[PDB]
UniProtKB/Swiss-Prot annotation:
Keywords for the protein's UniProt record, in alphabetical order: ATP-binding, DNA damage, DNA recombination, DNA-binding, Nucleotide-binding
Listed PROSITE patterns: RECA_2, RECA_3
Any one GO biological process: DNA repair
InterPro entries according to UniProt: AAA+_ATPase, DNA_recomb/repair_Rad51_C, DNA_recomb/repair_RadA, DNA_recomb/repair_RecA-like, DNA_repair_Rad51/TF_NusA_a-hlx, Hlx-hairpin-Hlx_DNA-bd_motif, P-loop_NTPase, RecA_ATP-bd
Protein name, entry field: DNA repair and recombination protein RadA
Pfam families: HHH_5 (PF14520), Rad51 (PF08423)
Nucleotide-binding found in the keyword field: yes
Positions annotated to bind ATP: 101-108
Function statement: Involved in DNA repair and in homologous recombination. Binds and assemble on single-stranded DNA to form a nucleoprotein filament. Hydrolyzes ATP in a ssDNA-dependent manner and promotes DNA strand exchange between homologous DNA molecules.
One term of GO molecular function: ATP-dependent DNA damage sensor activity
Lineage per the UniProt record: Archaea, Methanobacteriati, Methanobacteriota, Methanomada group, Methanococci
Disulfide bonds listed in the record: none
Length: 318
């Protein structure tokens, strides 16, 4: 921290108390959020921000550099060949991918399966040149349970079938039971503290992303209030995925209100704010028995595609 221009041991002690130890945290901070700190002036604030941006080499990039920035994105396998394919390889770090769908479509199963696959090094796809082994060593996950449906038994079960040690997954997965939107948002914000404490958080799950907001801001005459809170939450999930190069996953519910992308009739809740904020948007449907269909309907560079898979005692497979 003292490498930053206009930063001595005192200011450095103040920056750490305020939770600003990461250079990126500072390079992407505002002179406003920094001044809220004690003896940190406006000039000293702006100087360190410029210093951090610089040290982090945050400027104009072109040519081959653009490809290298993109190479820092590692992906998490979903245990489904078709799904990973449709995903362009797997679940992307530095992005928010949402799985919306009818009850029992397996949104929760996907969140669980992921926490498990995150503990199998061969399920993290990356380019050693851009992403070092250390950066993805001892990966941990954060599961923000919004409805109370986290199931350790399922983690254990899915773990065994993967040939992994269930308890090992439970030991490297933090679970936070959120009872409302306020808790949900604060838990997400405190994920930095888990990292600050040495936890290599590489997976973040918000299940469910919207159920709380919808129950709290029922009268659509407060929809603006909801959209606002929800928008701040989403920005936090996005910045989190970027700075700590981890994958963020969220589940969403669907409403009767139509929205034809084909057969359709339903649509993920959360309105526009969720739509714009989510990097990859899926619609999971149920087929015969344990058959499921995940329909990718929005992403920045991939075409819309359906992926077929199943939910068995093993978790996700095929
Ligand atoms: N141990 C298991 N063995 C086989 N199938 C299972 C097992 N556990 C769960 N399932 C399947 O998973 C389905 C439920 O998946 P789930 O992830 O809860 O869907 P969901 O989208 O999260 N539902 P909801 O949150 O209410 O909208 C069940 O109804 C079972 O068919
Ligand atoms: K249910
Ligand atoms: K549920
Ligand atoms: Mg991103
Ligand atoms: Mg669920």
């Amino acid at each position: 921290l003292t490498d930053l221009p206009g930063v001595g041991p005192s200011t450095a002690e103040k920056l750490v108390e305020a939770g600003y130890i990461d250079f990126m945290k500072i390079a992407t901070a505002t002179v406003g959020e920094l001044t809220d700190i004690e003896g940190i002036s406006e000039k000293a604030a702006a100087k360190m921000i410029m210093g951090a941006r610089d040290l982090c080499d945050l400027g104009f990039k072109s040519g081959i550099d653009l490809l290298k920035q993109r190479s820092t994105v590692w992906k998490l396998s979903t245990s489904s060949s078709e799904l990973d394919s449709v995903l362009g390889g797997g679940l992307e770090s530095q992005s928010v991918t949402e799985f919306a769908g009818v009850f029992g479509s397996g949104k929760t199963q996907i969140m669980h399966q992921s926490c498990v696959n995150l503990q199998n090094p061969e399920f993290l796809f990356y380019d050693e040149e851009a992403v070092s082994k250390g950066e993805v060593a001892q990966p941990k996950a954060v599961y923000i349970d919004t409805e109370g449906t986290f199931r350790p038994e399922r983690i254990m079960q899915m773990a065994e079938h993967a040939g992994i040690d269930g308890q090992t997954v439970l030991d490297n997965t933090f679970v936070a039971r959120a009872y409302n939107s306020d808790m949900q948002m604060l838990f997400a914000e405190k994920i930095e503290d888990l990292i600050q404490e040495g936890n290599n958080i590489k997976l973040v799950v918000i299940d469910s992303l919207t159920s709380t907001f919808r129950n709290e801001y029922t009268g659509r005459g407060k929809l603006a209030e909801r959209q606002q809170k929800l928008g701040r939450h989403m920005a936090t999930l996005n910045k989190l995925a970027d700075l700590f190069n981890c994958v963020v996953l969220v589940t969403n519910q669907v409403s009767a209100k139509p929205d034809a992308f084909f057969g359709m009739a339903e649509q993920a809740i959360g309105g526009h704010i969720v739509g714009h904020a989510a990097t990859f948007r899926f619609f999971v449907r149920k087929g015969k028995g344990d058959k499921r269909v995940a329909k990718l309907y929005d992403s920045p560079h991939l075409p819309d595609a359906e992926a077929i898979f199943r939910i068995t005692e093993k978790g996700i497979q095929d």
